[PDB]
Amino acid sequence: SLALSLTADQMVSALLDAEPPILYSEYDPTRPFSEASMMGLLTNLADRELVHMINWAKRVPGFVDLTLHDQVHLLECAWLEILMIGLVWRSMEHPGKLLFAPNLLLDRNQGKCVEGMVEIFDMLLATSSRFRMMNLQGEEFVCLKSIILLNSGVYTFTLKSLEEKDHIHRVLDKITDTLIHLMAKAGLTLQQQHQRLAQLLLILSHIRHMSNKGMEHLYSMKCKNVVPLSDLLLEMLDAHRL
């Protein structure tokens, strides 16, 4: 595995290079918002982002060493967490707003347009605030996003099919090494390094919580026929079996 032979600097470079682009929404400022149109904009955007996410995952060191079925499982588990951490990152410099796209910046009041949404917006805004407090760095963000990809589904997959999992744990260990390397280079003390590492990883619990709530929300919008969802998005939603 080339993945396990990367230095910390090489891991950082690989992850930075693999970053997907920031997409635009179809937002038309002339069209008055409705519940349907807002869900339309957000789900249209998510659907286009999913295609780039799939191709990003292929470039995360270690990911394509996995069987296709294992790759499918990890993305099915993690896709909404990954969309969410990206959104929070884009929003870090816009206190009180969520930057879904450069032309779609929404505040909590606008979230009320959609039933049950404002509570999810509030959670996302709090995560953005936490990122700000910690002064999260870009190099740290890309490490966390790859950890989400590799970790979120790792406990829900024969003895032979058991050490597909060991490789994943080894790559996760390399990413931990990389995070610590970044912090040491930033001048943090050993104590500060382990403290910050824990602070960053604890945010992943909150991101999991938000994804679980968001998945239930999306399922509700589907059942209510609020808007049609793309085939890909329906498939990714159906994987959670709500």
Binding site: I54, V72, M236
Partner: peptide
């Protein structure tokens, strides 16, 4: 699945 196919494309 679409995901499976795109992971192959």
């Amino acid at each position: 699945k679409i995901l499976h196919r795109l992971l192959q494309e």
